[PDB]
A paper describes a structure:
In the nitrate-bound, inward-open structure, a triangular electron-density peak of a nitrate ion was also observed in the substrate-binding site. However, we found several differences in the recognition manner of the substrate nitrate, as compared with that in the occluded state. In the inward-open structure, the bending of TM7, TM10 and TM11 leads to a slight movement of the side chains of Y263 in TM7 and R305 in TM8, away from the centre of the transporter. As a result, the following changes were observed in the interactions in Sites A and B. In Site A, the distance between one oxygen atom of the nitrate ion and the R89 guanidinium group is increased from 2.7 to 3.1 Å. In Site B, the distance between the nitrate ion and the Y263 phenol group is increased from 2.4 to 3.9 Å, and only one oxygen atom is within hydrogen-bonding distance with the Y263 phenol group. These changes in Sites A and B increase the volume of the substrate-binding site in the inward-open state structure (37.6 and 50.5 Å3 for the occluded and inward-open structures, respectively). Taken together, the overall structural change in the transition from the nitrate-bound occluded to the inward-open state, including the bending of TM7, TM10 and TM11, induces the movement of Y263 and R305 in Site B, which enlarges the volume of the substrate-binding site. This change in the substrate-binding site may result in decreased substrate affinity in the inward-open state, thereby facilitating substrate release towards the cytoplasmic side. In contrast to their conformations in the present occluded structure of [name], in the inward-open structure, TM7, TM10 and TM11 in the C bundle are bent at the conserved Gly residues. As a result, none of the interactions in layers C1, C2 and C3 is formed. The transport pathway is thereby formed between the N and C bundles, and the substrate-binding site is accessible from the cytosolic side.
[name] is highly expressed during anaerobic growth in the presence of nitrate, and plays a central role in nitrate uptake, while NarU has important functions during severe nutrient starvation or slow growth. In this work, we demonstrate that [name] is a nitrate/nitrite antiporter, using an in vitro reconstituted system. The overall structures of [name] in both the occluded and inward-open states adopt a canonical MFS-fold with 12 TM helices, with TM1–TM6 and TM7–TM12 forming the N and C bundles, respectively. The substrate-binding site is located at the interface between the N and C bundles, in the middle of the TM segment.
Numbering used by the authors: 14 to 239, 247 to 464
Amino acid sequence: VITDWRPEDPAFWQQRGQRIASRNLWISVPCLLLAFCVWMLFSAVAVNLPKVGFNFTTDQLFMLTALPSVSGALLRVPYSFMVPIFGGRRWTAFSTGILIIPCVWLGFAVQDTSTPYSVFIIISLLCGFAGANFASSMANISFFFPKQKQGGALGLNGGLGNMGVSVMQLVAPLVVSLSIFAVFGSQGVKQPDGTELYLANASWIWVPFLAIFTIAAWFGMNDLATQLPVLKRGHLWIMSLLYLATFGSFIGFSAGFAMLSKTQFPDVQILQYAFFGPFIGALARSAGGALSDRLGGTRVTLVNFILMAIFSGLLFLTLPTDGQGGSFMAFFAVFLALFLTAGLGSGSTFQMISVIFRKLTMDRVKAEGGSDERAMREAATDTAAALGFISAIGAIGGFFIPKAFGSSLALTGSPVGAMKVFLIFYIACVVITWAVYGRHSKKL
Ligand SMILES: [Zn+2]
């Protein structure tokens, strides 16, 4: 539909470009925000499942939590490929729209305790599709902006997008105590304290908003007429660990924190507070990116990783052993530090990756001869392709962290096994980051 698109031309940006770009960003954001809601749905639902009569083991509950990152991580690169094929307009609507399927489904499944575990697996995997909308959403919205304004534009899209996790964790525990949707078949379950739990509401609540913004994408967003070899580059694989330790930890803690808290402090209503982790984690991401812009992303990343390690070590002192020899207040504080520090890490790592990967490619093609034009060109495309692939690999952390808790608990009755692996991982990361700093990035 839009065949003349010249965002770098000031006149064009004034008469038509900015208006168009602005409308597309402000439909993009709520669409992405909702996807993140759906992606992490089981982080609030699985804790409430035994409260409605389900008898799944602890590991099974963590698994339901973990799996949507597997399918999300898998579809991220296919999803980025989709937006040039079907256009940003129809694909945003569609990638938003289909999420009504798991939402609606989970609602009924949750009211029937004869629903097999297998059915929840399937739903869990379907929610994961929402994890892939990022790759697609981000790819798309960059085309609507000139180079000078893309950082701001992508920052806001991804930024507010990641907010979806904490807004879902915020309202899901609240709507779950109301008897709305009675006429759609919601049924309450009386709890020990005398109140009533409407678990269907946790997912059903997003259906009206999903539908509203599917429409908004279809009629409101526009289409604009305007990779393999990068896997061989070893630096991509090194960088992918860093993002996975940061972004993967943001998501992974988002998925597993509430379930873990219940296993460690069974008498705390953690869903009253859990949303605050992903909240500050999402805000930290943008702060991480801003600090990297001014200070250098590897420097920020390195310090952050050191904090990540320290804070993951402190977490052991907060735990009960075995009866109740622990402290929930310290446990929470520390996790907020880990949430914050993971989010910050997301942003510093992401910024660092694109910087390091641009200069590596620039220097390489210059070294074999080639115009500055061809140098900038191949630096552009390769980093774009590198960043997509990293962002896919990173999401795997969202599976590994809660799944590790689950296996740790099932095999030892303690989470200490899972936390030992995390600590080691962070330690290796500060070493890896120290390395690139000494090897590439100290000279900037
Ligand atoms: Zn190197």
